[PDB]
């Protein structure tokens, strides 16, 4: 599908370019930022010179009553912090000329798609997300957007590959879109507002549900683990930990050493600005730092099946996550060990991805002994009314026997400007 797209905006050979057969010209403003870790991730600020303009080849300029078309892209929208963002819809992707064409716009907790013909007939499809929520799947996290348009039926908006809303557009007549596509914050009153965007595509047909799911999987880069926000998980980067079975708890340490243990304690508390957002605090607990087991690779991205060590930060000092698997029972309680005294304790962790129909960017950690034998996925277990962190082959066996397992799925949360906590 990507090879058949009429616009394939990608960053390669050290420049942003249209990879389609049309090779439409790209005009990049001076205040456009490209992520050094992944230059396909584009940051657009609320500045006149923070814009990208695509000069479409004349053959693909939309001017039709009947041609179906679709668009897909990923977006990461920082949390709205101020009341100035209320009741302020602002365009981000503009293909309107004389108020005919299409455009993508944003508002407080909304992603909006608008179609309008040449006779003042308009239709909108909207995806709504709340900021009054403990843990949000959408606030400041990478979202895959797909919008399809059937001129004889409906316009549909998809989020992470799932249909969210559809509205009829068959009453619209001739849609004559703009000769260009302007990626730019237009009409936003929040001077600090920005967006992240990547993998923009334009299609000259109505994508079906299977094609959208396949695009969502192909562009997810499943061989690379992700942090909570959807960026690449990295080594040597401090992360606040979130266990998905107990989202209201955070990781803490009950004394350093084999005599102590790591556990989950709550509540997290809340961060809030009245009438704007009310969420669970994410910057809580002892931070984890992922360390390389194979130092022969210079790259700092954590990939699937990588073996790692887990460092634990306690009072600005780093310790080693480990356990003695010879302890009684199937739930091996984890401790934070002094790095010089790890000895032969089990500490090697195999990082894994976990992709189901729930929250994205799940990670799993399979602890192994120094001989390579599985100790079990890292989760937690109730000991004396305390949720102590454990490694248990019980988790691994349920997955092997097609049983559902919860408690061993984690998210790594780094400090990000889009969260502001
Ligand atoms: Na270390």
Author numbering: 873 to 1293
From the paper:
Botulinum neurotoxin (BoNT) is the active agent that causes the deadly condition botulism. The smaller 50 kDa light chain (LC) possesses a single zinc-endopeptidase domain whereas the larger 100 kDa heavy chain is comprised of two domains—a target cell receptor binding (HC) domain and a translocation (HN) domain. The BoNT HC domain is responsible for targeting the toxin to a specific cell type and the specific receptors involved have been identified for most serotypes. As with all reported structures of the BoNT receptor binding domain, present is a characteristic β-jellyroll fold at the N-terminal half and a predominantly β-trefoil fold at the C-terminal half of the protein.
We have identified a single crystallisation condition that produced two crystal forms of HC/A1—one possessed the equivalent disulphide bond whereas the other did not. Using 25% w/v PEG 1500 and 0.1 M MIB pH 4.0, HC/A1 crystallised into orthorhombic crystals with the space group P212121 (crystal form 1) that diffracted to a resolution of 1.45 Å. No disulphide bond was observed in this structure. Instead, Cys1235 rotated away from the junction due to a backbone rotation, bringing the neighbouring Lys1236 toward Cys1280. Our findings suggest that the crystallisation condition is not the only determinant as to whether the bond is present or not. For example, serotype /A binds to a glycosylated luminal domain of the synaptic vesicle 2 (SV2) protein, preferentially to the C isoform (SV2C), as well as a ganglioside, namely GT1b.
